[PDB]
Amino acid sequence: HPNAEDFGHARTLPTDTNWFKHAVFYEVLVRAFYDSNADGIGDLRGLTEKLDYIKWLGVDCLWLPPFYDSPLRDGGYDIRDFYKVLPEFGTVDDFVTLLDAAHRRGIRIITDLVMNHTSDQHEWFQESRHNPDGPYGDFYVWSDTSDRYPDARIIFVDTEESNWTFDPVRRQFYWHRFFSHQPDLNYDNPAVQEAMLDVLRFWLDLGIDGFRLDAVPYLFEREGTNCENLPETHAFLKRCRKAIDDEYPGRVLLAEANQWPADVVAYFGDPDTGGDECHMAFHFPLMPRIFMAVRRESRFPISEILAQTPPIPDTAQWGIFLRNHDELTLEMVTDEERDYMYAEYAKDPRMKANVGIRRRLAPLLENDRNQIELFTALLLSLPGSPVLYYGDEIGMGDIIWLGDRDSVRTPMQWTPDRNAGFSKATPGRLYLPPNQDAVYGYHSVNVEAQLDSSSSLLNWTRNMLAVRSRHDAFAVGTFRELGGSNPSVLAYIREVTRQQGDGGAKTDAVLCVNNLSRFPQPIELNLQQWAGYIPVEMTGYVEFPSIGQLPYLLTLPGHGFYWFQLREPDP
């Protein structure tokens, strides 16, 4: 396989070990965003051309799902070659061109990297099956009977009948948590651990800013256990962190762990050292709770998981996004014991309809603009670093019939021109068709259309990111829930302390009041601690009456919200 110094590195951004705590991530598929070679398939060079838009929107880091050479039997999460970008997207050189172009305008790039399994077409697995006594015979978990690890569940219980599949060439069973064509790597083999660490090092040498390590809970398998979250799994992740900290300071490691908050906190590592595994993990059940909270018109389903989330290390940062399912397994996280909303979800008609299918923000909220704003407002003001999904800024829809994961992977709708301005190719050649319905269609929903009026959802979304970037409190500030008498209104305060002195938009206290009810609601808040302070609404720089000893009254419209800067009284 190739080497790093056979492609030349991209530009290195100034070393900063906290960028990911302040960043706003933008998940964008390479295939979906823009096509520059009129093949009907979005490519790296196209994505490079549209970086000016990304910059203008105000996102800080791109998150690319897997773009490695793949047979694409499982949406490219089945990697055939770790050192080769899929032909249709371009060459490794084209990726460096993207990196350099993105870094030039301060935009970072991270990527999905599946750790647990490779495609059965990967050269390793072909060498393991054909040459069992060769150097790759122990790269995958082989067996003579499928009795091993019987406590481990079948993830895709409707597609796979067993986690052991019989290979005809080697005449043996091979282990796989996922699909039968995605054999599990044997992480007990020391050579395998070194091989995957070299894969990390390759892209890090090219100058990538980080990874999202997919399917990491399933790395190691041990008898008498469900083969999930085993100590040796965590031990390997600690090596990856060390390799990052030692060789490339200021890079990030995201952990895709689709588990309850109380479990994923272990993936940040030993808290005594302030973290020695992953920098970020995803707080998965936030969106399902926020969703049900708006359904009930009660704040408590949000309050509960925020209260029940354990504290994380100093380096660590939560990752949050507005989706109900994990893109890997298409499963909504839930714990039968620790989730009190466990039985509740299936009973809700709206939740029940989209079980196992990725949906965009706009369809999830039935295209209600006021709601889209509220959910976005919560995403940007709640603790942890937020991830925006491409096209949600202009309120694109989805096409469910294309597949449970493809539904949200249609082409980006740039103009109302042919193919929504995504490609010059004939409509038949497109990898997926653009949205054509009366509601979310490219004739009515596109970037070009929304660029003009500052009332558009694109421009609204853009400005909200502009406001968020002006106050550190949102990114890395404390979080204290204010409560209130009205159950329908969720109010809280983010706060950052005066480091060696100052009184700017840096060392702020900010107040967020969100109304989960569809009707207008009054809330009497207790802000005595900020007596004398002047609340200033951020989107308009309007001064409200100063806070006193008596409860402060705020009135919101249905699904409305306010963002106040708590400003000091004048000495």
In the block, tokens 């999830």 appear at 364
Does the protein bind a second copy through residue 529 (CB under 8 A)? no
Contacting range for a second copy; rule: CB under 8 A; set: 23-31, 37-45, 306-314, 512-520? 512-520
Residues 325-354 that bind a second copy (CB under 8 A): 353
Residues 157-176 that bind a second copy (CB under 8 A): 161-162, 166-168
Residue 524, contacted partner among Ca ion, a second copy, none, CB below 5-8 A by kind: a second copy
Q: Are strands 542-543 and 534-537 parallel, antiparallel or unpaired?
A: antiparallel
Considering the complex, state which of residue 174 and residue 284 has its C-beta at the smaller distance from Ca ion.
Answer: 174
Of 70, 116, 410, 413, which lies in the binding site for Ca ion, with binding defined by CB under 5 A? Answer: 116
Residues 64-103 that bind a second copy (CB under 8 A): none
Which DSSP symbol is given to 76? Answer: T
Of 189, 193, 298, 415, which lies in the binding site for a second copy, with binding defined by CB under 8 A? Answer: 415
Paired tokens of 81: 């070659």
Considering the complex, state which of residue 218 and residue 474 has its C-beta at the smaller distance from Ca ion.
Answer: 218
Instruction: Exactly one of 256, 263, 277, 508 is catalytic; name it.
Output: 256
Contact between 204 and 9 (Cβ < 8 Å)? no
Which DSSP symbol is given to 411? Answer: P
Residue window 423-462: x/- pattern of binding to a second copy, with contact defined by CB under 8 A = ----xx---xx--xxxx-x-xx---x----x-x-------
Residue whose C-alpha is closest to residue 47's, from 104, 101, 93, 111? 101
Does the protein bind a second copy through residue 399 (CB under 8 A)? yes
Q: Smallest distance from the beta carbon of 196 to Ca ion, in angstroms?
A: 11
Does the protein bind a second copy through residue 38 (CB under 8 A)? no
Of 36, 91, 126, 146, which lies in the binding site for a second copy, with binding defined by CB under 8 A? Answer: 146
Contacting range for Ca ion; rule: CB under 5 A; set: 67-75, 120-128, 213-221, 378-386? 213-221
Q: Smallest distance from the beta carbon of 380 to a second copy, in angstroms?
A: 17
Residue window 542-571: x/- pattern of binding to a second copy, with contact defined by CB under 8 A = x-xx-------xxxxx--x-x---------
In the block, tokens 């409560």 appear at 483
Considering the complex, state which of residue 319 and residue 363 has its C-beta at the smaller distance from a second copy.
Answer: 363
Residue whose C-alpha is closest to residue 528's, from 551, 554, 497? 551
Contact between 342 and 408 (Cβ < 8 Å)? no
Residue whose C-alpha is closest to residue 566's, from 483, 505, 480, 498? 505
Contact between 153 and 253 (Cβ < 8 Å)? no
Which regions of 18-96 does DSSP assign to beta strands (E)? 25-27, 61-64, 68-69, 81-85
The answer on whether 172 is annotated among ligand-binding residues is: no
Considering the complex, state which of residue 337 and residue 401 has its C-beta at the smaller distance from a second copy.
Answer: 401
Instruction: Exactly one of 112, 120, 214, 472 is catalytic; name it.
Output: 214
Considering the complex, state which of residue 147 and residue 272 has its C-beta at the smaller distance from a second copy.
Answer: 147
Paired tokens of 427: 């409509």
Does the protein bind Ca ion through residue 184 (CB under 5 A)? yes
Task: Return the percent helix, strand and coil in the chain, to nearest 5.
Answer: 30, 20, 50
In the block, tokens 């019989």 appear at 166
Q: Using alpha carbons only, what angle is made at residue 412 by residues 408 and 414, rounded to the nearest 5 degrees?
A: 150
Q: Smallest distance from the beta carbon of 233 to Ca ion, in angstroms?
A: 9
Q: Smallest distance from the beta carbon of 174 to Ca ion, in angstroms?
A: 11
- Which residues, at least 6 apart from 212, have a Cβ–Cβ distance to it below 8 Å? 63, 110, 111, 112, 113, 254, 255, 256
Catalytic residue at 214? yes
The answer on whether 117 is annotated among ligand-binding residues is: yes
Q: Smallest distance from the beta carbon of 557 to a second copy, in angstroms?
A: 5
Count of residues making up the chain: 571
Catalytic residue at 256? yes
Residue 162, contacted partner among a second copy, Ca ion, none, CB below 5-8 A by kind: a second copy
State the Cα–Cα distance between residues 123 and 113, nearest whole angstrom.
18
Q: What is the DSSP string of 146-199?
A: TTSSTTSPPSSTTT-S-SEEEETTTTEEEE-SS-TTSPBB-TTSHHHHHHHHHH
Residues at the interface with a second copy (CB under 8 A)? 146, 161-162, 166-168, 180, 353, 366, 368-369, 399-402, 415-418, 427-428, 432-433, 436-439, 441, 443-444, 448, 453, 455, 517-522, 524, 537, 539-540, 542, 544-545, 553-557, 560, 562
Catalytic residue numbers, as ranges? 214, 256
